[PDB]
Amino acid sequence: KPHRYRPGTVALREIRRYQKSTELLIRKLPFQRLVREIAQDFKTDLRFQSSAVMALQEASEAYLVGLFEDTNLAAIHAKRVTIMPKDIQLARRIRGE
């Protein structure tokens, strides 16, 4: 019989793994694509240092992750383990955004 883990066990191992890891979790070139797409909405045909793209990737991942710890706090504060977009809206409203 092919093994199947009970749910969340792999999720917890993922949590341990990616808390242990330091690297970026976003695909680099699609992120560059989206950054340039937002950029042309302000000024077209600009050039980018790849360092600027990596800095934006780091800051974006950090802001997202901190938002997710706040979301996790809200969800467990609501006595749930599944996060919801309303949790994110709550967290952003608490942060003053």
Binding site: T9, L12, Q19, K20, A62, I76
Partner: protein
Amino acid sequence: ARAKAKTRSSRAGLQFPVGRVHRLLRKGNYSERVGAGAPVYLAAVLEYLTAEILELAGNAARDNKKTRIIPRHLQLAIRNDEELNKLLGRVTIAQGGVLPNIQAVLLPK
């Protein structure tokens, strides 16, 4: 007839450049005049702070048996001190990762 040009960091027994920091204050436009002991005091404060953060970083690298300090070790050091994290809560380290933290309700029975 000049004396030997001695260095003010050695005069205060310090590592950080007194002259460079004084030049930065003179050209950073914070006042037109700067008291002489002020960059010395600033450099000493900075040396103290760098000493503690580097010491914690080396301790963390030793804990991870690593002989060359890592930005991961910098994150682990800066976040595991209460006063340092209260000093630098809004500041992010590139490639720092996150603290290992799982809520107890997330943990299984």
